[PDB]
């Protein structure tokens, strides 16, 4: 929801499913996948920074 | 013991059956 | 023909079209992303299916998926 | 061959007699004014389009798809526009509502003539 | 049948065969040759080698078999190097786990596994000695395991 | 690369010097089998030291260095 | 051990061959 | 329908040569055709089952006919130790002159039937060629019956309804009762009426089998339950199999153990055996409901087994749905159960040799075991291959909502990690110990070996009476509970067979048993690491979760995301077929080198020279291929010249497999373009143009055809070496 | 200064360490050869 929040994912096809990651971008411009999140570890394409929607976006405290 | 029968059946199934069966299957590709 | 389907992860960064050596994929103005772009695959009759798009598809997991369908003359890519 | 297969005729124009490389192999003379090139398959032709375009300005180029009944087609360019550049004329086909995450299981497509992504 | 090894006859036949067969090479050299001295030390390394197998069980082959039941009459065969070995790779496993859960939180963890922090590496290299009651005290703390890590579809 | 080759050839001339039976081989070449490398005596592998004559054993050369040295005239 | 039973055998498997082509040209 | 794949229009439009190969390899893939729905599927596999059964009975009528007509069967009956069992005769026009002198056995030039068939037909009670002809006609008739049914149930109004196919409920009421229970009961009706009297000398052919009862008094004072009369007078000691000397007249005596003379099981034991198995299966046929309604609803049998412990998901609720609707689950259980049955068959054909004068010809016994082990491994790999086909093209995790199967796909990570652990452990602790023993033996010292006595197998042989170890437990101790408990019934006839070292039952055991049996468990756990891997990661992995969308044998995903060579669920097949041939490799090398030490006699030749690897490559491959590879010389040839040829032939199969396995397509796809350029451009051949366009083999086919040459080369090489090795050291 | 950082890399530490444990086994098998007990 907010920038910089540590966020676990709930979409089973991501490489980072059930792994927390830091929110880079939150866009408020009707984008279906507005929240650009990057990570510590890296998938097979060499690309940690991906993006997600709000339903697949669980913050922690 | 009809000993002459392999001298008939072993060629007519060993070679000429995979000639005409090549014809039947391979024309049967186009039928 | 190799059915190329382009899902809604397609943030329109055009490495698919610039990566495809067949112009089966173009870019379509689609007001659903930040860049306003989303690729399309109209001419999948020319689609080889070499999956050079899915190499250079920097989405989360593969907005553009190339399903290996039928094999015509052009989709087999034979020279003669 | 030209009696039964589609020959792809890349036509283009230039300014100087440079030297490019054929997809057949080996260098070609590169007529300066305007020149055609009959090719075999499309990846050769657009590989020549990348062969020229990543070197220098070669634009106003496109293959006429010679199919053996006689007529032509217009590949590459299609719309006076470069394909990764966005023109507001290309109507999108080949999309679904979401990611792979909502594709149906193939035990629901089983014994039916559908696809695992159609929804 | 597992005979006690010090009185198996074919075992002693292997003693005669390797001492005498190795002594066939000793019939080439003079009394002060360094080769000949090496075969003196080698014959020592055969008689000691066979007298130090006096409590094994060489069967019908004259070859010393083992036992892995933990009979406590044969614990020096297997279970004592079993406990010893599991201590050594519980050391190595605990050192590797402790070092990775160090460098998981550093500045550049990718650089930390190429270039080992020999400060913190040789910290943990030695510090993983009491790993049974360090893993048993981290396991009661809810820290040895993990939960809700990566998984595929289903 | 030439540094590794000179380390290698200096290795061959030193293994010919210290470890080999080359001076003994030069007496009767057709009887004494050529050997340089004298295996260290650990468990069992002292059996690799072949009694190749020359009053000293070790694993046998097949690289033919001694035939290059007799042609060279190394005495 | 005889010859006539061999003829009877290839008759019965010739008929069985007609059931093989008979089943074969329906599935 | 238009061209070739009269069944798939996705391949009839293909102009290449792929329409041929995929037209062949997807022919039996009935779940993926043009418009073949469920009723049109079961009504085709049900007919093709009949075509298959008629192929089986045509084949067994083939063996009956060649043994009936070209074999030496009754001359073999005269002297079953001396004369070799002849197979079908030869007609080569290629055997010039010197070959024919290396095959004449009488007037015939026939092959020597190394398939154990005369033994089984000799214990059945076939003592003539006439009964073989009447049996061969009796199976040509039966194959005509099965072809009649498969042709008959594809005739349209006799194509049965799918609700009949979904009477899953009652097939088990009829297979367990009729197919298994009655027929085995009927097989006692053979053994009581044929094998017992024609073993005890009485030629009970098809005449007097209703006028000569197998017991001299029978069935009018025998509904009264005086059943000890049928086990009254056994065949004790002084009998040769076939005559009437030294034999009693009891039918169902359970002595246990072997013959003294033929070293096979008693046919009284098999008559009583199939009779008891018959009664227990007929009892098991009364298990499920039907139109009557006295039995078990299967939904009430998988629904009820949800534990209140709660650990095992929401129980099996969902399993009965995914066996009716599925087929690859049902075929996976079928190949699993048949495969474990085959391995049980193999582990008992040598151990308890059933057939008289087997374990006397040492080649047929060496071929039956290896035969059923390679068929055993093939059918396990079929069970897991259709397991992965079940998890892709047949699995519904919404009818399997948090089911036992969905629980399996949940903890598949722990499953594959622990299979990989035990396979790694055994692979560093067989190969570690063989390279230890081989270095140490190599360094002039066989004594400094690690030999671990396999005490658990020695203790289990002590539980079955093998007194040669000194444990003195349940049956080895003659005073225990089980030792007294069957002291009259079957023990003293059986412990003689156990404590003997002639027979192949409960063998004497060195540490080669230890190191090899760990190598076998390495093979099982690697092969299930692969199969359970690409059966549980068959559906979706973290490399690509799209895998369920692509079907079973999709090729790859391209170079994207690092490279994706062999990600499919077909790879687990493709690799665990190598591990199948390897593992069954070590099983049959171990068995065959154990029995080339027993049959030669020098068991110490095994136990001293099998604990390390040059014991195998020296004492078994280098030495026992000597009468093989002398199959033909520049001095002449002998009868082994077939196998020594086949041997070499099979190497040429095997390494051609590597041409497809190692070197993949895009080499050849740009080499066929040179061949088609050269064919198009040349004169006198540009007239003869192809119709199907020449295209190199696709990379599922290519890995498959390289696998097929790997199997055919492997199995023909080892079938050459078993038979030429034992037939060279003997016969 | 940075030489020790080269001596802290993966293969150099792996050879200075596996050289050391290999030295433990080789020196512990000259001194105590043929150790099948314990
Ligand atoms: C950090 C050290 C470490 C630790 C604690 C473990 C622990 C484990 N591994 Mg392992 N592994 C490691 C390193 C480690 N691994 C490395 C470096 C590799 C690459 C070779 C592997 C490859 C590997 C495979 C392929 C498998 C395991 C498995 C397992 C589990 C079963 C135990 C086993 O058989 O080990 C396996 C041990 C080995 C394969 C060899 C030992 C690994 C190295 C050489 C020893 C550790 C030294 C390490 C480099 C020290 C670094 C720290 C130091 C510099 C300060 C266990 C949780 C298995 C599993 O999933 O079971 C549940 C399994 O199948 N591991
Ligand atoms: C499982 C059922 C089963 C099977 C597979 C067989 C199989 C066989 N029986 Mg048979 N048999 C059975 C049940 C069975 N029987 C029963 C229940 C009876 C009692 C009526 C008999 C009584 C019987 C007789 C009397 C003879 C056979 C014979 C034979 C053999 C040749 C049959 C032929 O030519 O056609 C064949 C191996 C014949 C045989 O073995 O030749 C000596 C023969 O003469 N059978
Ligand atoms: C009593 C009635 C009866 C009987 C005898 C059968 C018999 C058969 N049915 Mg069937 N069926 C029945 C009722 C019956 N059915 C009913 C009522 C239904 C409807 C609910 C069906 C529905 C049905 C379907 C849908 C299918 C069959 C099929 C089959 C065939 C199985 C394949 C086969 O031959 O395996 C033979 C197997 C054995 C003999 C035993 C194998 C395993 C044992 C344990 C090992 C062998 C024993 C021994 C150790 C080895 C001896 C070998 C020797 C060399 C020593 C078989 C002929 C299938 C088929 O192939 O179609 C024809 C098929 O698809 N049936
Ligand atoms: C399904 C197999 C089968 C079949 C068809 C028959 C059929 C027959 N048996 Mg029979 N029988 C069988 C199994 C079978 N038996 C078995 C397993 C045993 C051992 C318990 C016997 C023991 C037996 C005796 C002891 C007698 C028969 C007899 C008979 C005949 C008259 C009843 C009849 C032909 C009677 C007869 O005249 O024998 C031919 C007779 O006295 N049977
Ligand atoms: C009764 C048992 C049984 C049955 C009914 C099936 C049925 C099926 N299997 Mg199958 N399978 C089985 C056992 C069985 N399998 C076993 C035991 C294994 C392990 C070896 C497999 C491994 C297997 C794989 C890997 C695949 C199947 C597939 C299939 C499906 C399509 C098969 C097809 O179209 O082939 C068409 C027919 C052929 C290809 C002919 C077979 C020729 C083979 C390849 C080589 C034999 C050539 C021979 C050795 C050369 C002779 C020369 C001589 C010198 C030896 C079908 C439902 C496929 C599937 O469902 O995926 C979509 C698939 O990919 N099966
Ligand atoms: C000689 C042939 C060979 C060998 C040894 C192996 C060995 C192995 N395969 Mg395998 N495989 C082979 C051929 C072979 N394969 C072929 C032909 C195929 C078909 C392509 C496969 C397909 C296959 C699959 C599909 C799988 C395996 C797996 C495995 C591993 C099983 C677990 C185990 O036993 O670990 C014990 C480890 C060993 C036996 C390794 C050998 C020990 C080495 C030599 C010592 C370490 C190096 C040593 C110090 C030398 C240093 C070198 C020097 C330069 C410094 C094991 C490494 C599986 C796996 O990953 O399991 C976890 C797996 O899933 N294999
Ligand atoms: C790095 C591993 C290592 C370790 C821990 C040791 C440890 C030891 N060495 Mg040693 N040594 C090593 C490598 C090693 N060495 C190498 C690589 C060589 C070859 C140059 C030697 C050559 C060597 C000799 C020649 C001697 C030792 C001796 C000793 C012991 C002295 C106390 C001690 C146990 C001495 C000893 O106790 O032997 C009697 C001794 O005389 N070592
Ligand atoms: C992985 C399987 C395996 C296992 C379990 C063993 C086990 C053994 N090997 Mg061995 N070996 C193996 C593989 C294996 N080997 C292979 C693959 C090879 C070929 C390279 C060899 C080659 C080999 C040789 C040449 C010799 C052995 C010997 C031995 C024995 C003593 C080891 C030793 O040096 O103790 C001494 C080591 C120690 C005392 C060190 C432990 C001290 C710890 C680290 C200190 C810290 C404690 C806290 C031991 C039974 C020796 C023997 O006598 O055979 C019986 C021997 O001479 N092995
Ligand atoms: C993938 C898949 C699958 C698979 C397949 C298979 C292959 C399986 C496995 C399985 C198997 C392969 C089987 C096995 C089993 C096991 C067993 C069965 C064991 C046990 C044992 C026992 C039981 C024994 C014991 C004993 C004795 C020794 C004597 C006394 C008594 C008794 C009996 C107890 C399935 C279809 C399922 C599902 C789907 C998918
Ligand atoms: C006694 C004996 C024996 C054995 C057996 C047994 C005992 C078995 C079982 C088995 C078992 C009983 C197992 C268990 C397991 C389980 C689990 C559950 C595991 C765990 C693991 C873990 C937890 C790991 C971790 C770790 C650690 C701990 C340390 C560090 C490293 C690591 C991290 C890796 C024998 C016969 C040999 C011999 C005689 C005696
Ligand atoms: S999908 Fe990946 S590649 Fe295709 S446009 Fe969007 S970003 Fe560029
Ligand atoms: S499929 Fe092959 S060709 Fe068509 S776009 Fe994706 S990569 Fe380029
Ligand atoms: S090689 Fe061909 S098949 Fe194997 S991964 Fe690269 S692309 Fe996919």
From Swiss-Prot, chain C:
EC number from the UniProt entry: 1.97.1.12
InterPro entries, per the entry: 4Fe4S_Fe-S-bd (IPR017896), 4Fe4S_Fe_S_CS (IPR017900), PSI_iron-sulfur_center (IPR050157), PSI_PsaC (IPR017491)
Sections of the chain in a coiled coil: none
Cofactor: binding details: Binds 2 [4Fe-4S] clusters. Cluster 2 is most probably the spectroscopically characterized electron acceptor FA and cluster 1 is most probably FB.
Gene Ontology CC entries for this record: chloroplast thylakoid membrane; photosystem I
Top enzyme category: oxidoreductase
Domain 4Fe-4S ferredoxin-type positions: 1-30, 38-67
Main subcellular location: plastid
Cofactor: [4Fe-4S] cluster
One GO MF term: metal ion binding
The entry's keywords: 4Fe-4S, Chloroplast, Electron transport, Iron, Iron-sulfur, Membrane, Metal-binding, Oxidoreductase, Photosynthesis, Photosystem I, Plastid, Repeat, Thylakoid, Transport
Topological relation to the membrane, as annotated: Peripheral membrane protein
GO BP term (any one): photosynthetic electron transport in photosystem I
Compartment(s) where it occurs, according to its Swiss-Prot or TrEMBL record: Plastid, Chloroplast thylakoid membrane
Top-level lineage group: Eukaryota
Catalytic reaction annotation: reduced [plastocyanin] + hnu + oxidized [2Fe-2S]-[ferredoxin] = oxidized [plastocyanin] + reduced [2Fe-2S]-[ferredoxin]
Binding annotation for [4Fe-4S] cluster 1: 10, 13, 16, 57
Positions of [4Fe-4S] cluster 2 binding: 20, 47, 50, 53
HAMAP family: PSI_PsaC
Record's subunit section: The eukaryotic PSI reaction center is composed of at least 11 subunits.
Protein's recorded name: Photosystem I iron-sulfur center
Organism: Cyanidioschyzon merolae (strain NIES-3377 / 10D) (Unicellular red alga)
UniProtKB/Swiss-Prot annotation, chain F:
Subunit structure: The PsaA/B heterodimer binds the P700 chlorophyll special pair and subsequent electron acceptors. PSI consists of a core antenna complex that captures photons, and an electron transfer chain that converts photonic excitation into a charge separation. The eukaryotic PSI reaction center is composed of at least 11 subunits.
Domain of life: Eukaryota
Taxonomic source organism: Cyanidioschyzon merolae (strain NIES-3377 / 10D) (Unicellular red alga)
Transmembrane segments annotated in the record for this chain: 1-17
Name by which UniProt lists this protein: Photosystem I P700 chlorophyll a apoprotein A1
Cellular localisation: Plastid, Chloroplast thylakoid membrane
Functional summary from the UniProt entry: PsaA and PsaB bind P700, the primary electron donor of photosystem I (PSI), as well as the electron acceptors A0, A1 and FX. PSI is a plastocyanin/cytochrome c6-ferredoxin oxidoreductase, converting photonic excitation into a charge separation, which transfers an electron from the donor P700 chlorophyll pair to the spectroscopically characterized acceptors A0, A1, FX, FA and FB in turn. Oxidized P700 is reduced on the lumenal side of the thylakoid membrane by plastocyanin or cytochrome c6.
Family: Belongs to the PsaA/PsaB family.
From Swiss-Prot, chain H:
PANTHER family: OUTER MEMBRANE PROTEIN, OMPA-RELATED, PHOTOSYSTEM I P700 CHLOROPHYLL A APOPROTEIN A1-RELATED
Residue numbers binding [4Fe-4S] cluster: 556, 565
Membrane-traversing stretches: 45-68, 132-155, 172-196, 270-288, 327-350, 366-392, 414-436, 514-532, 572-593, 640-662, 704-724
A GO CC term assigned to this protein in UniProt: chloroplast thylakoid membrane
The protein, known as: Photosystem I P700 chlorophyll a apoprotein A2
Keyword Magnesium belongs to the record: yes
Binding site for phylloquinone: 668
A molecular function GO annotation: magnesium ion binding
Alphabetical list of InterPro entries matching this protein: PSI_PsaA/B, PSI_PsaA/B_CS, PSI_PsaA/B_sf, PSI_PsaB
UniProt keyword annotations, A-Z: 4Fe-4S, Chlorophyll, Chloroplast, Chromophore, Electron transport, Iron, Iron-sulfur, Magnesium, Membrane, Metal-binding, Oxidoreductase, Photosynthesis, Photosystem I, Plastid, Thylakoid, Transmembrane, Transmembrane helix, Transport
Organism whose genome encodes this protein: Cyanidioschyzon merolae (strain NIES-3377 / 10D) (Unicellular red alga)
Signal peptide: none
UniProtKB/Swiss-Prot annotation, chain I:
Gene Ontology terms: cellular component: chloroplast thylakoid membrane; photosystem I
UniProt KW keywords: Chloroplast, Membrane, Photosynthesis, Photosystem I, Plastid, Thylakoid, Transmembrane, Transmembrane helix
Transmembrane recorded as keyword: yes
Regions annotated as coiled coil: none
Signal peptide: none
A Pfam short name: PSI_PsaJ
Primary location group: plastid
InterPro entries: PSI_PsaJ, PSI_PsaJ_sf
Topology class, membrane: Single-pass membrane protein
Membrane-spanning ranges: 6-26
Gene3D superfamilies reported in the protein's UniProt record: Single helix bin
GO biological process assignments: photosynthesis
Subcellular location: Plastid, Chloroplast thylakoid membrane
Described function: May help in the organization of the PsaE and PsaF subunits.
Protein family (similarity comment): Belongs to the PsaJ family.
Protein name: Photosystem I reaction center subunit IX
């Amino acid at each position: 929801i907010k920038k910089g929040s540590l966020v676990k994912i709930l979409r089973p096809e991501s490489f980072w499913y059930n792994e927390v990651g830091t929110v880079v971008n939150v866009e408020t411009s009707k984008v279906l996948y507005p929240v650009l999140v990057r990570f510590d570890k890296v998938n097979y394409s060499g690309l940690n920074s991906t993006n997600f929607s709000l339903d697949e976006l669980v913050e922690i405290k | 013991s009809a000993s002459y029968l392999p001298s008939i059946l072993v060629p007519t199934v060993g070679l000429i059956l995979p000639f005409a069966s090549m014809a039947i299957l391979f024309i049967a590709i186009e039928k | 023909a190799h059915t190329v389907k382009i899902y809604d992860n397609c943030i329109g960064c055009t490495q698919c079209v610039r990566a495809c050596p067949l112009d089966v994929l173009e870019m379509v103005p689609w007001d659903g992303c930040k860049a306003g772009q989303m690729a399309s695959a109209p001419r999948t009759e020319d689609c080889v299916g070499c999956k050079r798009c899915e190499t250079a598809c920097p989405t989360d997991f593969l907005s553009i998926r190339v399903y290996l369908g039928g094999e015509t003359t052009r989709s087999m890519g034979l020279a003669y | 061959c030209a009696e039964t297969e589609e020959k792809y005729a890349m036509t283009w124009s230039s300014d100087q007699q440079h030297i490019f490389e054929m997809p057949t192999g080996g260098a070609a003379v590169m007529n300066s004014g305007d020149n055609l090139l009959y090719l075999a398959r499309k990846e050769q032709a657009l590989a020549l389009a990348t062969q020229l375009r990543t070197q220098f300005k070669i634009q106003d180029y496109k293959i006429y798809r010679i199919f053996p009944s006689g007529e032509v087609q217009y590949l590459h360019p299609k719309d006076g526009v470069l394909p990764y550049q966005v023109n507001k004329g290309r109507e999108q086909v080949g999309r679904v509502k979401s990611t792979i995450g909502k594709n149906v299981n193939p035990a629901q497509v089983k014994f039916t003539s559908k696809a695992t992504y159609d929804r | 049948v597992l005979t006690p090894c010090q009185q198996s006859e074919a075992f002693h036949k292997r003693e005669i065969n390797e001492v005498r067969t190795l002594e066939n090479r000793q019939a080439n050299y003079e009394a002060n040759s360094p080769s000949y001295l090496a075969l003196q030390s080698q014959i020592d390394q055969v008689h000691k080698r066979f007298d130090k197998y006096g409590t094994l069980l060489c069967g019908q082959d004259g070859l010393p078999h083992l036992i892995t039941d933990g009979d406590w009459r044969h614990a020096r065969e297997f279970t004592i190097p079993a406990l010893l070995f599991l201590y050594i790779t519980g050391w190595i496993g605990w050192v590797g786990r402790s070092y990775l859960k160090y460098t998981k939180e550093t500045k550049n963890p990718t650089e930390q596994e190429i270039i080992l922090d020999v400060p913190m590496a040789l910290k943990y290299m030695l510090s993983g000695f009491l790993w049974p009651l360090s893993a048993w005290q981290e396991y009661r703390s809810g820290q040895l395991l993990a939960k809700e890590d990566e998984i595929t579809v289903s | 690369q030439l540094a590794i080759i000179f380390i290698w050839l200096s290795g061959m001339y030193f293994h010919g010097a210290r470890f080999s039976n080359y001076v003994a081989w030069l007496s009767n070449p057709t009887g004494i089998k050529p050997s340089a490398q004298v295996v260290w005596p650990i468990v069992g592998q002292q059996i690799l030291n072949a009694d190749v004559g020359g009053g000293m054993q070790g694993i046998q050369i097949t690289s033919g260095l001694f035939q290059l040295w007799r042609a060279s005239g190394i005495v | 051990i005889t010859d006539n039973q061999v003829f009877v055998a290839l008759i019965m498997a010739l008929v069985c061959g007609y059931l093989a082509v008979k089943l074969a040209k329906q599935l | 329908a238009t061209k070739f794949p009269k069944f798939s229009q996705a391949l009839a439009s293909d102009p290449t040569t792929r329409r041929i190969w995929y037209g062949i390899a997807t022919a039996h893939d009935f779940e993926s055709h043009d418009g073949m729905t469920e009723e049109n599927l079961y009504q085709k596999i049900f007919a093709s089952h009949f075509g298959h059964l008629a192929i089986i009975f045509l084949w067994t009528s083939g063996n009956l006919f060649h043994v009936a007509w070209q074999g030496n069967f009754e001359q073999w009956v005269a002297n079953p130790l001396k004369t070799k069992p002849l197979a079908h005769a030869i007609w080569d026009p290629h055997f010039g002159q010197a070959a024919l002198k290396a095959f004449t056995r009488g007037d015939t030039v026939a092959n020597i039937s190394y398939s154990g068939v005369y033994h089984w037909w000799y214990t059945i009670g076939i003592r003539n060629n006439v009964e073989l002809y009447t049996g061969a006609l009796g199976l040509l008739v039966l194959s005509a019956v099965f072809l009649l049914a498969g042709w008959l149930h594809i005739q349209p109004k006799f194509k049965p309804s799918l609700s009949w196919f979904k009477n899953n409920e009652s097939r088990l009421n009829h297979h367990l009762a009729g197919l298994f229970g009655v027929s085995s009961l009927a097989w006692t009706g053979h053994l009581v009426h044929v094998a017992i009297p024609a073993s005890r000398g009485q030629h009970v052919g098809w005449d007097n089998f209703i006028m000569t009862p197998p017991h001299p008094a029978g069935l009018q004072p025998f509904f009264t339950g005086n059943w000890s009369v049928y086990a009254q007078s056994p065949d004790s000691m002084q009998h040769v199999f076939g005559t009437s000397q030294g034999a009693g007249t009891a039918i169902l005596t359970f002595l246990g153990g072997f013959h003294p003379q033929t070293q096979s099981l008693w046919l009284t034991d098999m008559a009583h055996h199939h009779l008891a198995i018959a009664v227990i299966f007929i009892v098991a046929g009364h298990m499920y409901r039907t139109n009557f309604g006295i039995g078990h609803n299967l939904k009430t049998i998988l629904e009820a087994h949800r534990p209140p412990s709660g650990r095992l998901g929401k129980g099996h609720i969902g399993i009965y749905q995914t066996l009716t609707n599925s087929l690859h689950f049902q075929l996976g259980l079928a190949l699993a159960s048949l495969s474990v049955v085959t391995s049980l068959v193999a582990q008992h054909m040598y151990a308890m040799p059933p057939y008289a004068y087997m374990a006397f010809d040492y080649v047929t016994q060496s071929a039956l075991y290896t035969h059923h082990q390679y068929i055993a491994g093939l059918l396990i790999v079929g069970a897991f291959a259709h397991g992965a086909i079940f998890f892709i093209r047949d699995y519904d995790p919404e009818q399997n909502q948090d089911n036992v199967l969905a629980r399996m796909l949940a903890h598949k990570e722990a499953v594959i990690s622990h299979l990989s652990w035990v396979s790694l452990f055994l692979g560093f602790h067989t190969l570690g110990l063989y390279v230890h023993n081989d270095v140490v033996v190599a360094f002039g010292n066989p004594e400094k070996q690690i030999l671990i006595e396999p005490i658990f197998a020695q203790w289990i042989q002590a539980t079955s009476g093998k007194m040669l170890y000194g444990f003195q437990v349940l049956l080895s101790s003659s005073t225990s509970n089980a030792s007294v408990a069957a002291q009259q019934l079957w023990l003293p006839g059986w412990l003689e067979a156990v404590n003997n070292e002639s027979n192949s039952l409960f063998l004497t055991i060195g540490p080669g048993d230890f190191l090899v049996h760990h190598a076998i468990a390495l093979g099982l756990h690697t092969t299930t690491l692969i199969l359970v891997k690409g059966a549980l990661d068959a559906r979706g992995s973290k490399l690509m979760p799209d895998k369920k969308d692509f079907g079973y044998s999709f090729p790859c995903d391209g170079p994207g995301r690092g490279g994706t060579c062999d990600i499919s669920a077909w790879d687990a097949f493709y690799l665990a077929m190598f591990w199948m041939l390897n593992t069954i490799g070590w099983v049959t090398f171990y068995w065959h080198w154990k029995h080339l030490s027993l049959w030669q006699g020098n068991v110490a030749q095994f136990n001293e020279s099998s604990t390390y690897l040059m014991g195998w490559l020296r004492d078994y491959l280098w030495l026992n291929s000597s009468p093989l590879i002398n199959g033909y010389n520049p001095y002449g040839m002998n009868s082994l010249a077939v196998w020594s040829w086949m041997f070499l032939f099979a190497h040429l199969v095997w390494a051609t497999g590597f041409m497809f396995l190692i070197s993949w397509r895009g080499y050849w796809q740009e080499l066929i373009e040179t061949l088609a350029w050269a064919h198009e451009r040349t004169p006198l051949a540009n007239l003869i143009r192809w119709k199907d366009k020449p295209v190199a083999l696709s990379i599922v086919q290519a890995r498959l055809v390289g696998l097929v040459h790997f199997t055919v080369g492997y199995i023909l090489t080892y079938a050459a070496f078993v038979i030429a090795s034992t037939a060279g050291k003997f016969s | 200064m940075n030489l020790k950082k080269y001596l802290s890399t993966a293969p150099v530490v792996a050879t200075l360490w596996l050289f050391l444990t290999a030295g433990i086994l080789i020196e512990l098998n000259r001194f105590f050869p043929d150790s099948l007990f314990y």
